[PDB]
């Protein structure tokens, strides 16, 4: 299976008083495993993984050392940016940055990615090759064209391909027990009436990782989209994620319909029978 | 572990 | 100066039980700006040891949070989250509905 590593920033202007608000949250696929918050009193980058705190003292200083430069980049960006955007020096924006890369199942580097966003919009991004830019407007051209000039694409490939790789494959080693493991979901099915005549069968995954699933309804063996409510994948607070899918069917009709469970920890796709 | 050195926008 | 309002998902880590120990939890995803006001709340009152994670966001850039408590589901408690968003005109209460 392919594996990645996300390292994820938001910065918020407070024009009022003071620098931005700058939290930095790190990720090896759906787990965090560090964090920075400029509000935190440590004003060092955090461990958020037991697996993490293998690492020895001079891993976190190197660590704080690179994201407090990062806060500054973002904070002098929100200055520019504001005057590219001709804004009110009043009022608050955000800059938003995530980068990382995956390696394949060979654990061999497979993709790198860097994507910025002001104000909620795509900004500028590095291209899949990782060799050019795509700009989103023509304040991104500014941008492009210095981080072009500069040979940004190339230092940031460099890290991608080499770096990056290298320590996500550190991490994966070190952390097996937990982020190699495949937790598959946990179901079952409840039945609800809500009249005399229809009831509500809803069918739950519980308990699994990663967040990648599909849930749906079959009748008679078609798949049913007509009066069905599907949740949006959610965390359960212990590292693991819950869904859930329901249809409203008439009462002593629930045989014909199944409940279809499909994830990577499941060799063969689960079918639910019942309610 | 974290790229070493963002460039500014 | 793109604002979307905040998804909200209120539900237990475990499957509740009466009398039996668990987490309730407030999902608040799909929204920007990211500042945001997020209250548990036990018949209404505001529950005091709560926690939530790390602010992150989703490819399109909308943010989300989860926040959390240790809690005891009872047959006549009443449980809920509390939003408030510059996107709402007033704080949005969703309770929490154990089959849910």
């Known amino acids: ?275 | 572990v974290l790229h070493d050195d963002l460039l500014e926008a | 100066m793109i604002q979307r309002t905040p998804k909200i998902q209120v539900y237990s880590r475990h499957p509740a039980e009466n009398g039996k120990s668990n987490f309730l939890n407030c999902y608040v995803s799909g929204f920007h700006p990211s500042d945001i006001e997020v209250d548990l709340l036990k018949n209404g009152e505001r529950i005091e040891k709560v926690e939530h994670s790390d602010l992150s966001f989703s490819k399109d850039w909308s943010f989300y949070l989860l926040y959390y408590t240790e809690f005891t589901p009872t047959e006549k408690d009443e449980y809920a989250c509390r939003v408030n968003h510059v996107t709402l005109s007033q704080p949005k209460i969703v309770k929490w509905d154990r089959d849910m």
């Open chain 1, 1 to 275: 299976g392919s594996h990645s590593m996300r390292y994820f920033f938001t910065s918020v202007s407070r024009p009022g008083r003071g620098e931005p608000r700058f939290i930095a949250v790190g990720y090896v696929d759906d787990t965090q495993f560090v964090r920075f918050d400029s509000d935190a009193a440590s004003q060092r980058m955090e461990p958020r993984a037991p697996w993490i705190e293998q690492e020895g003292p001079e891993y976190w200083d190197g660590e704080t050392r690179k994201v407090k430069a990062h806060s500054q980049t973002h904070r002098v960006d929100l200055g520019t940016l504001r005057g590219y955007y001709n804004q009110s020096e009043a009022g608050s924006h955000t800059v938003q940055r995530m980068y990382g890369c995956d390696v394949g199942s060979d654990w061999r580097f497979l993709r790198g990615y860097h994507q910025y966003a002001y104000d909620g919009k795509d900004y500028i991004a590095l291209k899949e090759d990782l060799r050019s830019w795509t700009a989103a407007d023509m304040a991104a051209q500014t941008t492009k064209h210095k981080w072009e000039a500069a040979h940004v694409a190339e230092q940031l490939r460099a890290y991608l391909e080499g770096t990056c790789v290298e320590w996500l494959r550190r991490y994966l080693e070190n952390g097996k027990e937990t982020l190699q493991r495949t937790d598959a979901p946990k179901t079952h099915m409840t039945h609800h009436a809500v009249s005399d005549h229809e009831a509500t069968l809803r069918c739950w995954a519980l308990s699994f990782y990663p967040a990648e699933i599909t849930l749906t309804w079959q009748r008679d063996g078609e798949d049913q989209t007509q009066d069905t409510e599907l949740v949006e994948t959610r965390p359960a607070g212990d590292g693991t994620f819950q869904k859930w899918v329901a249809v409203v069917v008439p009462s002593g009709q629930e045989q014909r319909y199944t409940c279809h469970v499909q994830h990577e920890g499941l060799p063969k796709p689960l079918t639910l029978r019942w309610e």
